[PDB]
Ligand binder design. Sequence first.
Ligand SMILES: OC[C@H]1O[C@@](CO)(O[C@H]2O[C@H](CO)[C@@H](O)[C@H](O)[C@H]2O)[C@@H](O)[C@@H]1O
Lengths: 551, 407
Amino acid sequence: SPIETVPVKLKPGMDGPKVKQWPLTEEKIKALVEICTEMEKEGKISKIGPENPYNTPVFAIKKKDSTKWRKLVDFRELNKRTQDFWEVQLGIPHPAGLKQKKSVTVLDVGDAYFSVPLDKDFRKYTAFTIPSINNETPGIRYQYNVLPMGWKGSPAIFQSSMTKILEPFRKQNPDIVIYQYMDDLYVGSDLEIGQHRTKIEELRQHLLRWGFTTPDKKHQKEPPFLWMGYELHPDKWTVQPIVLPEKDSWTVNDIQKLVGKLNWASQIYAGIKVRQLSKLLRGTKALTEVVPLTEEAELELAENREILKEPVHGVYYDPSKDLIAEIQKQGQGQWTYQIYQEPFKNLKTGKYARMKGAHTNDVKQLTEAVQKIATESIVIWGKTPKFKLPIQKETWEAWWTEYWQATWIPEWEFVNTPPLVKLWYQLEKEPIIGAETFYVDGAANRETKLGKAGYVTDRGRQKVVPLTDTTNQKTELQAIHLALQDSGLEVNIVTDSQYALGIIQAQPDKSESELVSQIIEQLIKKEKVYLAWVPAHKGIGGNEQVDKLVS
Amino acid sequence: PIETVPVKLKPGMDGPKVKQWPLTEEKIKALVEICTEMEKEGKISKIGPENPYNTPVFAIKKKDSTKWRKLVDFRELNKRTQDFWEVQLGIPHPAGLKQKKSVTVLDVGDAYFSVPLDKDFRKYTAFTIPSINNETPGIRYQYNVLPQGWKGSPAIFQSSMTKILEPFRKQNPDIVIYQYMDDLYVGSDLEIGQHRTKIEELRQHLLRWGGYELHPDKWTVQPIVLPEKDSWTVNDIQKLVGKLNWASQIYAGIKVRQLSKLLRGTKALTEVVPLTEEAELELAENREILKEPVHGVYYDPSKDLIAEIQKQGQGQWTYQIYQEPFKNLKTGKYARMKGAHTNDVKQLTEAVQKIATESIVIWGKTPKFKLPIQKETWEAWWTEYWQATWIPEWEFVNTPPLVKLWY
Ligand SMILES: OC[C@H]1O[C@@](CO)(O[C@H]2O[C@H](CO)[C@@H](O)[C@H](O)[C@H]2O)[C@@H](O)[C@@H]1O
């Protein structure tokens, strides 16, 4: 309570909220009055009158099981008018980032927000009114003297306040680890439990001087500690149990809940997949829309359910050993990883399944997975791990030598875990002797959406295909598709499309486009392909003849 | 007793609101040591979340001096800051710096820490130190002094800097010094050992009031080259015609009439076509034109500089600097000399620093880079290899190599 307040402002040019009070049942009014009275006695709020013009609605909501009433003030209007804040909560602590400690305590502070005073000049804005019953009186108005729940600035101002209060204790006790998450304090030490407990109550006393209680109901002295959704044992940690929906009939929203639970489970349960279930979310139009599970989605769900049946634990971090990250490929652009220091003793797991780009290959996605894990490792442990990757050094070598963008992966060892990541074809750097040469071209009418794709060859072959509902870029892709379709196992192709050349040169193995996908399929089945470019409309060789033909 | 210079953001622009990225343990520890010391010396002040601005902070270790250097990426702030062309506090660029045997670059950033910053502008300088595993919330500071990395600090300190160097510059008229950001570039035509010493002298003089060696004289333009063969295949000629057809939007009077007609018909790419004597003449003229710089290209100080880089393999990197498309002011080739040859990203980051350093020397400012790299690959690693106290503007391009024009 005696912390200095943090000054806060409205946004420039804006006044406080002036929102009418929704009428309310006397039962709610009576409960609001009771609660408000207690808060007033405790000094959290003060009575104000009608000469303050601001207002925010107050609602009354029921308790978890007691039937006790709960006061909510809907500050949506005040929040839009309150200045922005730079948030200081940069991330979420993760149990795999903890080192083993000899003595551990988890504590909370009680009434955290209501222990921090609010800027005196800002208080008028937090005005709310308890209505009379059917307007018997205008009603009773209060304003906040402390950080309100539901105000945009409360979390940051509390977090900063608590950092300032713990700063003296941290400096004086540098071999005591304090994880501070909002009002929740994890405290680990290498002290004997007698001396550790002494230090705990020194800490409690320090918080009490500054107006922070530490109620015993929230003081945990024995493992397993309940912390940040986990269970901390001395040697190992556990996610609190995850229960998945078990519907007969699934809506979009049900699926969204399921994928979410699975993502959360994937931090420790290896091999979780959500691609087929998430596919169900595409192109839907209501949260209430019933969605039948595809066969793939059902198999994916059952696979995950198997994985969940078995118990799992993570272990804690030992800084004197290396971090090792191992990735397996799961198919359809899905990846799963484990992070460990000793074999079969995971710190945590994870998955990477994002589709970046219309056109890509497994080597790029593996590179993205490496980058994701590398970022997560710096967040959690402040360093980057060594990688074990299911890709040969020859494959990686062929990739970064031929691919034109700069690329890199840090120190990694090949691990033989099929399926391995590979390039699925490689364009020839020189024209192939003995191969037929195809001059391809496609053109579309911007206005009509009609076009043609075709080719002419050094062996006297030629073909033109009419296309409907197409584009310029598709007719060019279509032209190459035709050349691959009608040619042998070795072929030289000459296009004037920088677009089509650019896609294919990057050796994609998958695409959101069915046409590109077909082309990839074709490329994989050839023995050798050389793909060359010429500028259009310069009357050059075969290109001129083929351009002439599509016309 | 010092008076601050009133400073404004540009009209209609707010301060920077850029999020801090994750930092390694050793960079966090370095920043916490540096920032508590700076807080003690009053150069920065601990702030809270009621200040809504932020700028990323990280650290770097130069290769020859292995203490950590704090680096606040004020690119966003600098873009939003008032021009000092208008308060007449800008710094002219001396031609002739590029004509010197050697140029030595000195980190002169600390000198800014003796001049207070306008009280109403400090909130825009906020930065946040992260914590390993988010054990604690971020810790926020703002500057009370001219901050390093801010474009305004050289402008405001400009009057003071000129006084400090007046004796050195009158004692040494042939030395040329240009100040860019936190850096002082010193150039001379003296032989290395002597040049160095006068650098030492300068260092001492600077210390009293309160490097990297470059040889611009040996940066060389790498022009477009046409292959030379005796037997030419249809594909060779096609590749040749497409290259010259592209070079014709840069150079004047390049023809492909003669080489192109050699390709009439629908021919196998492997078929060798002998050169007409006329096409051999066409090739000759084009070769000669490609040989000498383009006529009509001059630097415009009111326009931004742009740099493109292409990976060529085996440690080689081509680049072009221009202001308008196809009107290159400089084309070059960067080569890695480390010996490891293993890391594309480190090479590109060293290429970017070297190209930017040349622009500072030549034109007095860095270009905006078009980087041949995935945004996410660059952002995963580049700070591991950065060694400049400035950071240039950049964007990410995925441009497949149509013709390998520059190699
Ligand atoms: O690398 C791009 C990445 O850098 C950030 C840092 O968070 O900021 C810089 O980005 C651009 C690089 O030129 C500038 O436009 C910008 O001013 C600079 O801060 C991110 O904004 C960006 O995603």
